[model samples]
Target: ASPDAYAAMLGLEKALAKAGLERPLIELVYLRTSQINGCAYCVNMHANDARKAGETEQRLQALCVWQETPYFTPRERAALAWTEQLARLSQGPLPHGLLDELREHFDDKEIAELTLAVSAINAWNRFGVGMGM
Candidate 1:
């Protein structure tokens, strides 16, 4: 990255770190969002990050098809679903009423963190595909 780009991305990462979200949870969303965007480098890198952070192979394997998996908790499930929506930057009302579900597991601050993470990962994917990151 250029100096400006690196600083901006690092700023987002610094904020999310201070937000106190669980590390593996952040990785889960990043992993899934990377999968949807087909960002190969990110998909591999975040998966390894998750493992080093003690995420299980079982859970990681099922992340792409997470809705049907038994490995994720309710909170993680809501997060993965919302991650997909945020990636698409949906134009219409949510088809399945996700806000209520997200609210069940996360408060406003946490939700903001989640959204930021999703958006940042999308940007990272673009960096990889468009600029050879």
Candidate 2:
């Protein structure tokens, strides 16, 4: 593992803990984002984390097809959408309507925390890919 990457990951983890985002939800977002990024190491790590956090196999298996899956709730869907958009921002900024819709499910602080979580996972994926972690 990259020490610099580990340090950055630790910093982000501390920030996220201070933000008070739920552990399970944060793990889910990380797992989903890693999957999107095609970081096998991250995907495996986060999948184990999610499982340890009591996430169900059914929901985990359906994550790849979240839009078509019924296992996720409205809030989960919104978070996943935000994760996908942020992870693939080169496609363009996330639509305002979707952001507004997400706002309905999350407060400003929560949204900020979730965004940070998404960003942290993306960074981790990049580091993992580059360093073969």
Candidate 3:
């Protein structure tokens, strides 16, 4: 395989690995973003990754309706909310209180890394859906 196209994406992931964001949290964001994008390949892959990382099936099943579930902690809820907003950014500006919630849970560096995680997954999902994977 050629390297140029995917190199930047992989570099972003390497930076994310050094960002100290929890692995389970990263997978959850990826999975949630994939669900919002309706990317079946990403949904299936991230679901398995989360399982391998010890995430519960119940939480995975309820991720789409996470606001109604008690499965996630406050920190996770913030990250998911941020992920949703960024993934759907084409719709409009983020809601007013969203960043405040994210700030309560993450420091600047973690916030940057989390944003990169969401951006990376969204990019990957586009490829997957575009290719009909």
Q: Against the true structure, what is each candidate's TM-score?
A: 0.91, 0.92, 0.94
Q: How many backbone clashes does candidate 2 have?
A: 0
lDDT tens digits, residues 1-133, model 2? Answer: 5588578679988899888678888888999989888899999998998899899999889998889989988888899899989999878977888889989899899999999999998988898898777
Give the CA lDDT, 0 to 100, for residue 46 in model 2.
Answer: 88
Q: Which stretches of candidate 1 lie over 4 Å from their true place?
A: 90-93
Clashing pairs in 3: none
Each model's lDDT: 0.86, 0.88, 0.92
Task: Say which candidate scores most in TM-score.
Answer: 3
RMSD in Å for model 2: 1.6
Give the better candidate number (2 or 3) by TM-score.
3
Tell me, what's the RMSD of every candidate? 1.7, 1.6, 1.2
Q: Per-residue lDDT for 1-133 in model 1, tens only?
A: 3799888878887887887668799999889998988889999999999999999889889997888888999988888889988887745566567887899999988998888888888888888877665
Off by over 4 Å in 3: none
TM-score of 3: 0.94
What's the distance in Å from true for residue 99, model 2?
1.6
- Model 1 CA lDDT for position 131: 68
Question: 96 in model 2: Cα distance from truth in Å?
Answer: 1.7
lDDT ranking, best first: 3, 2, 1
